Symmetry: D2
Subunit: 266 residues, 4 copies
């Protein structure tokens, strides 16, 4: 008798125990969801990580850049959930931007930007095209986003990728609505993941690290209810809220799991 | 084992069985909530209406224009829920704008506009000031709104009142956060209430009625998942979603229960 | 051969040489505009101030709370510009919020808030209703605004008044368009006026003063082209740009003269 | 004694006499600007078109996909305007999206989308990187945009490209501010160009054509001051307003030359 009791939900984006998707999968499992998981490249690494989730879930290989993976996805999912069964939810927690994109903004070559927008924005439509035929009416497609309304230091082309992702969602909703399915994004505040901690520790340089740290601190002071960058649970709960039947008139939208920071100047 | 199981929630704004608040109260009761209700002026009428809710709830008199009602509210609530007990949720479903405000836009006198903004926008802060001292950490204040981003025909000063209400919410969140309480609004699409049907039937004139009907129709065509103006249940579910613990990092915000219409041009 | 050469423009809101309107009037006069000015209560004070403008302009008494002043305004203006002549532009640089409104947010009584919204938001429509019948096609109504999208400390009910003003503008544009007239707002960054400097110097308290100073500093760091709070000339130029024929397809809108700060997170 | 008297402005995007850039160049020339023009591929066609501008202007070859063109651009411009002279303005009126991108939204392959985002969004930063070193303090970079806030039929991936372009602008402003240069976009309503008329006449199909026509009609009814899709002059004037010194505190922003349509629901 959980929030997602009996729902069949696909969750992508697990790579480490710090991934937002890991906590999405954990909360959803605690809430009665039967999950199908997607992973990219490091499959043996992902299997080991996912063994720590409350329940066992079938792991599938999915590179969003691979057209053959996408074409075979619906088949590979139906084979995992059972014939005659469909998905009730889909979670997109996929994002990437080469080193040059997140180095000055003018120094990122288009090849790097294009790979970033492919994986971070275009993939949301790729996943929808492939999974909507095997989704039930009342279904929910959730994507992971960060507020790209105003420009910020260090994130550069990843912010551009988010602006595109938000636009992609708005169109996915048009297609998803034909199937009785909702399409929405969760705009989260900064969450200290492996990539987030490394960059803050000066992996992408000192100027990048200092800027990210000021962003994080500014977030907790702006957020009326506070913001804990070490806690992905408030984000994971919000995604489950969208996967549930408790937001039935919300599509093409963005739900801000940011502590209320986007609503405050200072 | 419901969404709001064991939560003590105050619900204002019930006047008829078509009121958005009636359905908010119904869904919340179905979800395990113990409710305290507020009514205005026509108390014998409201008692009769509320007798149709799944469970009995104490009815309290509250005119948001009455400073004595607001000052005595916390006391009257604690007396109803029991000493030592606090509220876990508050619902604002209060709105009014004299006939002249919703007649040309330039013809509404300030006395009429001021009464409208008092009841429709200022009251949200009045309620918060009075009920936050008797609210528990993790609490939720929800208000009823409609998207006032772009101007529209016939709604005129009620749209202005909504623009103010959205701004009020953003500040209420600053105060509510001190108490561990969230403050948010639900921006709903058109819902055929008694006031809504009367105005559409030419109560406020022909030009007003025709404009409202075009608004309603335009809403269903824009909304990717459709929009049923005769169904307040998708709205009522969204308010309960905010009263729950499933949106814990959302404050000073607006959740659109509009079928996705605000995200689409046409 | 200036930007507003031969244009007849009404300018309200001059009280001191630090008023945004004083600089609006100065730039417009430098640009070939023949001006009609409105003042409130301290008429002998305003006459003395306005004597410092590049050219002499007729001063008119206008309290926006006075219904008789508004009703007699068109007549008093036509008598000043000459019979058969009309206004080509109108400038609204009027704003007020009692001490309690800008003291905690919950402590402001409605009487104080209502006076604030009357003078700061409703007056924009009052002025439009009165001056549109004496405005020429191609005309321009400009109002002074500050970004109320996100809540901020100390400004409280003045921010709410701005949110309402922006909504009012959107409706004024509907009425103004019938006359071939544009209606827009200029959202300026902080400008060190007499009221602004006093409040920063601890007139409205220490917490208020400290918050305003942090707002000002944060503005210059966010603004890509910088922000000089001691210089109202960039604001005054933007208002003239809207009074000109160089923004002919912009109405119901907001032009941000803020140094680009609203477009940047940090 | 014009708006841009003595200003040296680069204008890209001229292909036909119906191109928004042709009218931008015409108005700017009428306003005292000395222009440098860029063209793509069909150089003999562009030279013939540009011969109809009020004054002769040097034409330069610039494919935004060509890294050698961008690297040699500053040199080729300085050689055209004269050594020691710099640009005071830059106009980006470049946009493209393959046939599949504007066919269902899910059917556009990434190769087509990537080419579109390259030419329509990334190119804005490419141009800025190359031309900022040869731009004077007080300079202005203007880009052509359409409101991508809400999704619409038929435009699909071109809308996504615009959402990215708006984000790109916000970052370009950060870099441009270092040089004392402003960076802004002009969001125009539909303008009947050769590509616009062809698509409306059923070049991209019937469903696409019908949708574009409904968009155009809906624009004129929403716009308080009206909207003439056959007139690019109001757009061209707005770009010149941004190239002027009359909007000195506006950067990373969007100016809507849409007749006020984005501010109105219906
Ligand atoms: N970290 C934050 O603070 C933050 C905030 C808001 C939103 N987000 C978003 O949340 C999502 C997940 O990020 P995270 O913070 O959990 O980090 P993460 O590194 O744990 O997740 C990114 C995931 O993308 C996957 N991925 C990359 N390239 C792929 C490809 N070609 N095919 C398929 N999958 C691919 C990786 O395998 C990984 O699982 C991203 O969309 C990110 O932008 C992050
Ligand atoms: N009807 C719609 O389509 C729609 C859409 C979105 C939001 N809303 C909002 O939902 C809320 C409820 O409206 P509804 O549509 O259910 O209509 P309704 O008439 O049933 O509710 C309005 C309520 O306001 C109360 N009220 C008025 N003056 C009051 C006062 N002085 N003190 C206390 N209460 C007072 C009335 O008693 C009534 O219960 C309003 O805030 C409204 O603006 C309505
Ligand atoms: N100061 C800033 O930083 C800032 C920034 C953006 C926008 N604004 C806005 O600019 C406008 C002008 O403010 P300012 O900063 O120049 O300060 P100001 O004190 O010089 O101007 C306010 C004006 O409002 C007039 N006014 C007040 N009550 C009135 C009434 N009843 N009838 C008629 N006029 C009345 C006053 O006489 C005065 O001229 C206001 O709308 C304000 O909110 C100010
Ligand atoms: N047409 C409208 O209604 C409308 C409305 C708002 C904004 N816009 C924008 O205005 C701009 C100009 O479009 P238009 O309507 O004048 O049409 P247009 O076809 O006349 O202009 C597009 C231009 O892009 C150029 N271009 C394409 N690929 C290029 C490349 N690889 N390198 C360099 N230049 C390249 C073309 O040569 C052409 O001059 C575009 O950015 C467009 O999206 C158009
Ligand atoms: N905390 C981070 O370092 C971070 N990381 N990413 C990210 C980028 C690529 C891949 C995975 C996550 C994001 O997408 C966002 C990140 O933090 C932000 C940045 C900006 C904002 Cl508004 C909110 C959160
Ligand atoms: N359907 C209606 O007639 C209606 N009614 N009210 C309203 C006004 C005063 C009191 C109660 C409800 C609203 O506040 C809003 C109403 O409909 C709208 C109007 C505009 C929009 Cl964007 C969405 C819904
Ligand atoms: N600098 C100030 O102190 C100030 N003052 N007023 C104000 C209020 C009432 C009457 C005149 C001006 C405003 O309306 C705005 C003011 O500064 C702000 C405040 C917030 C923002 Cl976003 C931008 C500028
Ligand atoms: N009228 C059109 O057909 C049109 N064409 N383009 C376009 C696309 C690619 C190249 C040049 C112009 C656009 O970028 C925009 C166009 O019209 C729109 C479409 C949407 C909106 Cl919100 C406003 C105008």
């Amino acid at each position: 008798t959980g929030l997602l009791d009996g729902k069949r939900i696909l969750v992508s984006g697990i790579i480490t125990d710090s991934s937002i998707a890991f906590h999405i999968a954990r909360v959803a499992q605690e809430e009665g969801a039967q999950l199908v998981l997607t992973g990219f490249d490091r499959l043996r690494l992902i299997q080991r990580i996912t063994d720590r989730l409350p329940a066992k879930a079938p792991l599938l290989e999915l590179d969003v850049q691979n057209e053959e993976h996408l074409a075979s996805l619906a088949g590979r999912v139906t084979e995992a959930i059972g014939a005659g069964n469909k998905l009730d939810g889909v979670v997109h927690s996929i994002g990437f931007m080469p080193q040059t994109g997140m180095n000055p903004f003018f120094d990122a070559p288009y090849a790097d930007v294009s790979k970033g927008i492919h994986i971070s924005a275009y993939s949301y439509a790729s996943m929808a095209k492939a999974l909507l035929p095997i989704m039930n009416p009342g279904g929910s497609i959730v994507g992971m986003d960060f507020d790209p309304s105003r420009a910020m230091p260090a994130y550069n082309w990843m912010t551009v990728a988010k602006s595109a992702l938000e636009s992609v969602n708005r169109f996915v909703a048009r297609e998803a609505g034909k199937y009785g399915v909702r399409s929405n994004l969760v705009a989260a505040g900064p969450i200290r993941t492996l990539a987030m901690s490394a960059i803050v520790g000066g992996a992408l340089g000192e100027e990048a690290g200092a800027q990210i740290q000021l962003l994080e601190e500014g977030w907790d002071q702006r957020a009326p209810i506070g913001w804990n960058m070490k806690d992905a649970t408030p984000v994971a709960k919000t995604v489950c809220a969208l996967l549930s039947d408790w937001l039935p008139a919300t599509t093409g939208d963005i739900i801000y799991a940011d502590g209320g920071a986007h609503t405050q100047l200072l």
